[PDB]
Amino acid sequence: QVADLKAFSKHIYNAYLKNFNMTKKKARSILTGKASHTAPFVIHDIETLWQAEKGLVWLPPYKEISVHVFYRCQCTTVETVRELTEFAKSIPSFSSLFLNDQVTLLKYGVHEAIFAMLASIVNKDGLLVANGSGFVTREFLRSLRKPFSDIIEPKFEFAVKFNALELDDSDLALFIAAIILCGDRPGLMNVPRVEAIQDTILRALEFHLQANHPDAQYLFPKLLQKMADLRQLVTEHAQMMQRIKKTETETSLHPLLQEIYKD
Ligand SMILES: O=C(O)CCCCCOc1ccccc1CN(C(=O)c1ccc(-c2ccco2)cc1)C1CC1
Ligand SMILES: CCCCCCCO[C@@H]1O[C@H](CO)[C@@H](O)[C@H](O)[C@H]1O
Numbered sequence: 001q002v003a004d005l006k007a008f009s010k011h012i013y014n015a016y017l018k019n020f021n022m023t024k025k026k027a028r029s030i031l032t033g034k035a036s037h038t039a040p041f042v043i044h045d046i047e048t049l050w051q052a053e054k055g056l057v058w059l060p061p062y063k064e065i066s067v068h069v070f071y072r073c074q075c076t077t078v079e080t081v082r083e084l085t086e087f088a089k090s091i092p093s094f095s096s097l098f099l100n101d102q103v104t105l106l107k108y109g110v111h112e113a114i115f116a117m118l119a120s121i122v123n124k125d126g127l128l129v130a131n132g133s134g135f136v137t138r139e140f141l142r143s144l145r146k147p148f149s150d151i152i153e154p155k156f157e158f159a160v161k162f163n164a165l166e167l168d169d170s171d172l173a174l175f176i177a178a179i180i181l182c183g184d185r186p187g188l189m190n191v192p193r194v195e196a197i198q199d200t201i202l203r204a205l206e207f208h209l210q211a212n213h214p215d216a217q218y219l220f221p222k223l224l225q226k227m228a229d230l231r232q233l234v235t236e237h238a239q240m241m242q243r244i245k246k247t248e249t250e251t252s253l254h255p256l257l258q259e260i261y262k263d
């Protein structure tokens with residue numbers, strides 16, 4: 001059964017191309033200046049942030065710059081949760097699950113997927129925003145006051161290392177599918193069914209990497225380790241979010257994100 005994993009992989013890639021607004025392909029063309037005549041507007045301080053909000057690029061009541069950026073981060077994660085939900089639903093084996101198990105997988109998997117996909121719009125100097133029309137510098141995000149700068153920097157560190165693996169969109173489609181269809185999530189109802197789906201995806205991933213990266217040694221075990229790394233990254237992220245909820249009482253959290261962090 002070699003030709004069915006290809007079709008299984010092909011369905012997942014099509015679900016990926018069908019549902020995500022930004023591909024790594026498009027992201028990398030922009031970040032390297034080959035995308036178009038127009039380059040992204042660089043946000044590196046308060047003035048350029050204001051100019052970007054004023055129209056050159058682009059919420060709850062305004063509070064301060066660091067909280068405003070945080071709100072922008074929430075806008076992007078919520079929208080990526082939407083895309084991941086439709087991505088997962090475009091996978092027949094995911095849609096076959098009972099709706100409550102679908103929610104459990106997304107609840108505990110979306111942030112791991114978000115921070116994996118985030119690497120696609122990141123370089124060591126910053127990341128793309130607003131569909132690639134802007135670029136926020138890493139230095140500017142580091143300059144935000146704690147705890148908001150603390151919750152951002154670890155994702156850049158993971159991203160730069162992840163990008164060294166040089167995955168393409170067909171690799172990431174399978175990788176993200178494996179994150180969402182994870183049998184370890186708490187409160188899962190049909191654990192054996194999810195684990196069986198996960199296993200098929202991981203077989204399809206290995207097969208796909210052998211075909212797509214023939215000279216890439218150890219790439220499949222490396223990606224399994226990155227899946228474990230994302231669990232730790234998201235664990236640390238949830239802890240920092242708990243601290244924001246305790247100490248930044250004037251900062252609003254989107255209702256959907258509140259439900260994800262309900263525990
Ligand atoms: O837990 C939650 O769901 C909500 C809390 C997330 C807090 C952490 O968010 C981080 C961390 C590191 C890197 C990127 C993001 C957010 N982000 C962005 O695309 C993004 C980043 C910066 C800006 C921006 C606008 C103006 C100046 O900067 C706009 C968008 C991708 C993950 C989604
Ligand atoms: C298939 C449609 C009907 C499904 C009805 C089953 C609802 O179960 C609920 O699923 C939620 C996770 O999704 C959990 O958070 C709740 O604890 C649990 O009670």
Ligand SMILES: CCCCCCCO[C@@H]1O[C@H](CO)[C@@H](O)[C@H](O)[C@H]1O
Pocket residue numbers: 081085103106107256259260262263
């Ligand atoms: C839309 C995809 C993203 C889903 C976001 C996660 C939703 O949170 C969970 O929704 C369940 C109701 O179904 C509740 O039982 C849980 O208490 C709650 O934690």
